[PDB]
Amino acid sequence: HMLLTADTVLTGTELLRPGWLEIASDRVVAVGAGAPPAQADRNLGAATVVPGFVDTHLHGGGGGNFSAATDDETARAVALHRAHGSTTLVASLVTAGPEDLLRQVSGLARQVRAGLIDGIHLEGPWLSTLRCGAHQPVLMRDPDPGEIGRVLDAGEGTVRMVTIAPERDGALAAIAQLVNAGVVAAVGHTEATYDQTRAAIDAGATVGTHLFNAMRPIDRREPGPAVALTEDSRVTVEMIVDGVHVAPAIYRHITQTVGPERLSLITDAMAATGMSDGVYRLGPLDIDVVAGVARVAGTDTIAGSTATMEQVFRLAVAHCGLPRDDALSLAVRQACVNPARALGLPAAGLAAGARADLVVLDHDLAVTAVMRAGEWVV
Amino acid sequence: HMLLTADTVLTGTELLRPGWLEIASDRVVAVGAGAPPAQADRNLGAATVVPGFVDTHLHGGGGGNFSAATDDETARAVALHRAHGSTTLVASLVTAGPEDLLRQVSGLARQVRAGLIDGIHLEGPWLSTLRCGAHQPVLMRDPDPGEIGRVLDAGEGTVRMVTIAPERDGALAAIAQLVNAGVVAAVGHTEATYDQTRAAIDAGATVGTHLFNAMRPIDRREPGPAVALTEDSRVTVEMIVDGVHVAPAIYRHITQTVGPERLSLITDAMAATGMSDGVYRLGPLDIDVVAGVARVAGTDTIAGSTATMEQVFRLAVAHCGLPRDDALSLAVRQACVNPARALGLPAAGLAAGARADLVVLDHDLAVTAVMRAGEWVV
Ligand SMILES: [Zn+2]
Ligand SMILES: [Zn+2]
Ligand SMILES: [Zn+2]
Ligand SMILES: [Zn+2]
């Protein structure tokens, strides 16, 4: 149906130069290096095609908040990230009271079924008040197996990931309850010790919520959660590489520690992504200054990013310390393959049978086109 | 000349079970697996043979202080550690005034030539006063190329390693000066930033002085010296795994990051090693030794260890999280191969032509015999 060629094709596992894809219907039919098996329909130029970006932890964008759980706000959040190459999105909810939580899950679950987003992430309410950040600590509470059951029932299988503070009473049981329901259990926003975090991993936690942020630091006597999470090969750690949340040497250090398959790039994007500076909302209030740097109003407590996956992809390539081609392969694993795997999402690899989600990047790695389900979004 | 057998022989690169070595005079002639090519002279039973331990950073033992620079105190420190398998020793000097420094270097340089010790390590005086520990901060000073030249001349090539605080004025010049003299430049006792430590590494520093101790901690925005040192493959980091200085998960974490060849086990042993408790007055400082645990009398700042390489080898094996055989193989690289390589000392590997330094361990991995220069010390 459509046969595309390009000077660089990243499949998830290989680097094709030049490369070509047969996309036909809604699947990738074939991929290979060299000249295509037939005449091409669209011959791209000096561009790099990568698989669609898979953002597994974001709160909104383009002025829209996923926490609003309305068709209009989700569409405008979805519109921005999709325009920038994020072909899969897991919508994150911050801490909230029991009633609103149920309303938000039900409202978003419809938009998953509708296809705008691919899943729900519960960041809160079961977090630590000492590591709140952009959350309202007063509403945080111990994970109660009754409410957990109600939320997944309300989601009809749409809750994909829940962040848990392993030091709250009943946290290890709640992790077991979540993992038995097929939900990913993540550790974050926690003052848990190394020992308490290691316990959560054995209970079934497999993801680290934005490593080093709202997280006990590494100390020579108390390693904290970050060491437990990077230690265990079952865990995929998140990192915000927007240039603000953690130093590039930290990103480099963790990649060194966990290897190519065990780190997921996320944006933690707030509603200001793609807009201008100004005062915004999340649950409390944010002020956005600098280059879209948001802090909870007058605290220097950083409240998410204003970055897109395109930007974190660019910074990962630039700051990972590898040459460009090796950097592209690493960043594609970290921004596409690994996060979808960690959350049991459809393999982002560009291989025969996979859904045709791909992004076209120019030499400077800016997005020039985006395909999802075999149709051009841009 | 002498043909020894034992059920397990680790050479540095292989695990032989059972194994045999042919020793003639002070060299290893040959090594192999299985039954020996002739009848053995010493048939070791259910023991494990390891290469001699290479302690590249220690301050004394058995009541003796290397800082004393006297035949009697050096003899008693060397005798104890040598009895426990440390067949190669670099004597470390704590911070001291210019006059005292010259006397001590000359005194130790004599004992290098005599064969008691194999080199001198200058830990201080060119360090930061904010991370002194068991040092007298008043005496620390900026590295002056005149005094540095005088110290190496006095040592006649026996000074093997100098710890440098990369944040002191003239630190990057001093590092270049040391490496041009064939001296190892180590980073330690420092508030350097990631950027300042990275500069020192590029200037020729190749060792990190007891990582995480007397060292700026890792922070998400200011990574500090430990990441710079672990990031760069030219650096071998020392670590004290005596159970007191750093948590085993940190040892495990760093090994994960830098790999099997880039960490050196050290003791940092003080004069109370092998003795009883009391107050020991090391480095013109009262040191209270409580239950092996020696800390600067008063504070909770630990002032070195009371461990031997046998003990740090044992704890590394137990806490590295690997299966027994792999733990033995890893620990031998960290306790024998890596430290001798980092300081350009004779390869501790047990291979044809190498000097016959070996250690006999029983089932609990305690030292039962020690060979040096092909002769049994115990
Ligand atoms: Zn968060
Ligand atoms: Zn978040
Ligand atoms: Zn020290
Ligand atoms: Zn020392």
Author numbering:
A (entry chain B), B (entry chain A): 0 to 377
Any passages from the paper?
NagA enzymes (EC 3.5.1.25) are widespread in nature and found in a range of eukaryotic and prokaryotic species as metal-dependent enzymes with a physiological role in catalyzing the deacetylation of GlcNAc6P to yield GlcN6P and acetate. Our X-ray crystallographic structure determination reveals that MSNagA conforms to the urease structural superfamily, with the same overall fold, domain topology, and architecture as other NagA enzymes whose structures have been determined. Domain I (residues 52–344) is a twisted (β/α)8-TIM barrel that is comprised of eight alternating β-stands and α-helices and encloses the catalytic site of the enzyme and the metal-binding site. Domain II is a small β-barrel comprising eight β-strands contributed from the N and C termini of the MSNagA protein (amino acids 1–51 and 344–382).
The MSNagA protein in the absence of ligand crystallized in space group P1 with four molecules in the asymmetric unit. Although no divalent cations were added during the purification steps, well defined electron density corresponding to two bound metal ions was clearly visible in the cavity of the (α/β) barrel buried at the bottom of the active-site cleft. Each MSNagA monomer in both the ligand-free and ligand-bound models contains two metal ions positioned between 3.1 and 3.4 Å apart from each other. Given that the same protein expressed in M. smegmatis contains predominantly zinc, it was decided to model the metal-binding sites as zinc rather than iron (see “Experimental procedures”). In all chains of the apo-structure, the metal ion that is more buried (M1) makes four interactions coordinated by the side chains His-56, His-58, Glu-122, and Asp-267. The second metal ion (M2) is held in position by the side chains of residues His-188, Glu-122, and His-209. Coordination is completed by water molecules with one water molecule modeled as bridging both of the metals and another bound to M1. In both of the MSNagA crystal structures, the protein forms a homodimer burying a total of 3,200 Å2 of the surface area. The carbonyl group of the GlcNAc6P substrate is positioned ∼2.5 Å from the M1 metal ion, which is ideally primed to stabilize the transition state intermediate formed during catalysis. It is of interest to note, by comparison of the apo- and ligand-bound structures, that there is little conformational change in the binding pocket upon substrate binding to MSNagA.
